Design a protein around this motif. Structure first.
Motif, PDB file in Angstrom:
ATOM      1  N   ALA A 262      23.454  35.920  25.578  1.00 49.84           N
ATOM      2  CA  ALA A 262      24.075  36.699  26.853  1.00 49.84           C
ATOM      3  C   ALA A 262      23.347  38.253  26.909  1.00 49.84           C
ATOM      4  N   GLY A 263      24.014  39.002  27.635  1.00 47.48           N
ATOM      5  CA  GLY A 263      23.204  40.415  27.898  1.00 47.48           C
ATOM      6  C   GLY A 263      24.571  41.482  27.695  1.00 47.48           C
ATOM      7  N   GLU A 264      24.637  42.528  28.465  1.00 48.96           N
ATOM      8  CA  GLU A 264      25.555  43.573  28.611  1.00 48.96           C
ATOM      9  C   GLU A 264      26.814  42.803  28.919  1.00 48.96           C
ATOM     10  N   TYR A 265      27.902  43.080  27.951  1.00 48.64           N
ATOM     11  CA  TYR A 265      29.203  42.776  27.989  1.00 48.64           C
ATOM     12  C   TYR A 265      30.031  44.123  28.677  1.00 48.64           C
ATOM     13  N   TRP A 266      30.518  43.929  30.013  1.00 48.60           N
ATOM     14  CA  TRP A 266      31.389  44.767  30.600  1.00 48.60           C
ATOM     15  C   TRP A 266      32.766  44.402  30.979  1.00 48.60           C
ATOM     16  N   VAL A 267      33.725  45.321  30.499  1.00 45.91           N
ATOM     17  CA  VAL A 267      35.134  44.982  30.434  1.00 45.91           C
ATOM     18  C   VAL A 267      35.583  45.209  31.890  1.00 45.91           C
ATOM     19  N   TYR A 268      36.335  44.535  32.608  1.00 50.07           N
ATOM     20  CA  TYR A 268      36.645  44.272  33.995  1.00 50.07           C
ATOM     21  C   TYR A 268      38.146  44.929  33.985  1.00 50.07           C
ATOM     22  N   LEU A 269      38.348  46.379  34.216  1.00 48.92           N
ATOM     23  CA  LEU A 269      39.585  46.969  34.010  1.00 48.92           C
ATOM     24  C   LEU A 269      40.901  46.447  34.896  1.00 48.92           C
ATOM     25  N   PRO A 270      40.742  46.122  36.200  1.00 44.85           N
ATOM     26  CA  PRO A 270      41.885  45.647  36.775  1.00 44.85           C
ATOM     27  C   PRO A 270      42.744  44.517  36.182  1.00 44.85           C
ATOM     28  N   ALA A 271      41.877  43.652  35.760  1.00 42.91           N
ATOM     29  CA  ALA A 271      42.358  42.226  35.131  1.00 42.91           C
ATOM     30  C   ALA A 271      42.979  43.039  33.735  1.00 42.91           C
ATOM     31  N   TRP A 272      42.325  43.827  32.959  1.00 40.68           N
ATOM     32  CA  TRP A 272      42.844  44.144  31.641  1.00 40.68           C
ATOM     33  C   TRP A 272      44.241  44.856  31.985  1.00 40.68           C
ATOM     34  N   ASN A 273      44.412  45.816  32.954  1.00 40.17           N
ATOM     35  CA  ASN A 273      45.535  46.489  33.183  1.00 40.17           C
ATOM     36  C   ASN A 273      46.657  45.876  33.612  1.00 40.17           C
ATOM     37  N   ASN A 274      46.260  44.918  34.862  1.00 41.41           N
ATOM     38  CA  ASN A 274      47.499  44.032  35.337  1.00 41.41           C
ATOM     39  C   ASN A 274      47.897  43.221  34.283  1.00 41.41           C
ATOM     40  N   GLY A 275      46.946  42.633  33.595  1.00 43.11           N
ATOM     41  CA  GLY A 275      47.267  41.742  32.249  1.00 43.11           C
ATOM     42  C   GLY A 275      48.328  42.312  31.527  1.00 43.11           C
ATOM     43  N   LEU A 276      48.068  43.709  30.886  1.00 45.33           N
ATOM     44  CA  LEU A 276      49.048  44.476  30.166  1.00 45.33           C
ATOM     45  C   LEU A 276      50.113  44.679  31.081  1.00 45.33           C
ATOM     46  N   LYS A 277      50.339  45.097  32.092  1.00 44.48           N
ATOM     47  CA  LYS A 277      51.553  45.178  33.005  1.00 44.48           C
ATOM     48  C   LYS A 277      52.293  43.811  33.202  1.00 44.48           C
ATOM     49  N   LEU A 278      51.771  42.759  33.182  1.00 47.29           N
ATOM     50  CA  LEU A 278      52.383  41.303  33.172  1.00 47.29           C
ATOM     51  C   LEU A 278      52.816  41.027  31.813  1.00 47.29           C
ATOM     52  N   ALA A 279      52.067  41.403  30.740  1.00 46.81           N
ATOM     53  CA  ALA A 279      52.665  41.412  29.340  1.00 46.81           C
ATOM     54  C   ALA A 279      53.935  42.114  28.981  1.00 46.81           C
ATOM     55  N   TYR A 280      53.808  43.471  29.618  1.00 47.26           N
ATOM     56  CA  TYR A 280      55.107  44.340  29.080  1.00 47.26           C
ATOM     57  C   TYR A 280      56.128  44.090  30.074  1.00 47.26           C
ATOM     58  N   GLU A 281      56.013  43.593  31.069  1.00 39.64           N
ATOM     59  CA  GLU A 281      57.132  43.062  32.079  1.00 39.64           C
ATOM     60  C   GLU A 281      57.629  41.921  31.588  1.00 39.64           C
ATOM     61  N   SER A 282      57.143  41.132  30.889  1.00 44.56           N
ATOM     62  CA  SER A 282      57.612  39.548  30.801  1.00 44.56           C
ATOM     63  C   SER A 282      58.450  39.670  29.530  1.00 44.56           C
ATOM     64  N   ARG A 283      58.614  40.648  28.889  1.00 47.60           N
ATOM     65  CA  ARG A 283      59.573  40.880  27.697  1.00 47.60           C
ATOM     66  C   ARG A 283      60.669  41.032  28.269  1.00 47.60           C
ATOM     67  N   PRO A 284      61.784  40.682  27.214  1.00 43.68           N
ATOM     68  CA  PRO A 284      63.291  40.725  27.904  1.00 43.68           C
ATOM     69  C   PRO A 284      63.720  42.271  27.770  1.00 43.68           C
ATOM     70  N   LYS A 285      64.324  42.758  28.875  1.00 45.16           N
ATOM     71  CA  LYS A 285      64.710  44.216  29.044  1.00 45.16           C
ATOM     72  C   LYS A 285      65.345  44.866  27.688  1.00 45.16           C
ATOM     73  N   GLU A 286      65.809  44.056  26.911  1.00 45.56           N
ATOM     74  CA  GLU A 286      66.596  44.449  25.816  1.00 45.56           C
ATOM     75  C   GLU A 286      65.329  45.443  24.907  1.00 45.56           C
ATOM     76  N   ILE A 287      64.455  44.994  24.198  1.00 50.63           N
ATOM     77  CA  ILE A 287      63.259  45.485  23.556  1.00 50.63           C
ATOM     78  C   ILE A 287      62.430  46.272  24.502  1.00 50.63           C
ATOM     79  N   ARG A 288      62.154  45.780  25.874  1.00 49.68           N
ATOM     80  CA  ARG A 288      61.474  46.614  26.562  1.00 49.68           C
ATOM     81  C   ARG A 288      61.991  47.907  27.049  1.00 49.68           C
TER      82      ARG A 288
END
Length: 79
Positions: free
Chosen positions: A44-70
């Motif tokens: 391969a070559g240059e690896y670029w991180v795509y930020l919208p997917a990253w941050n939307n992923g973090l958002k999904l992950a943080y919202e999917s935990r139950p409100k107690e811990i969160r």
């Protein structure tokens, strides 16, 4: 967000990790990635991180935990 993608080295600088660590993260399959590579080759070559997917992923992950811990930590601030 002027650019939705940054080279994985800059992303490494942002999270305080080394370059090798981040490349290992990519190889293990932990990060949303785009590959910039000369058309005239096939893996391969240059690896670029795509930020919208990253941050939307973090958002999904943080919202999917139950409100107690969160939402529990907010009590330490008076909420």
């Amino acid at each position: 967000l002027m650019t939705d993608a940054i080279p994985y080295q800059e992303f490494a600088k942002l999270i305080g990790k080394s370059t090798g660590a981040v490349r290992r993260m990519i190889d293990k399959g932990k990060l949303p990635v785009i590959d910039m590579t000369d058309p005239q080759s096939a893996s391969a070559g240059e690896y670029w991180v795509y930020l919208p997917a990253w941050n939307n992923g973090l958002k999904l992950a943080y919202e999917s935990r139950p409100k107690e811990i969160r939402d529990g930590w907010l009590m330490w601030l008076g909420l």
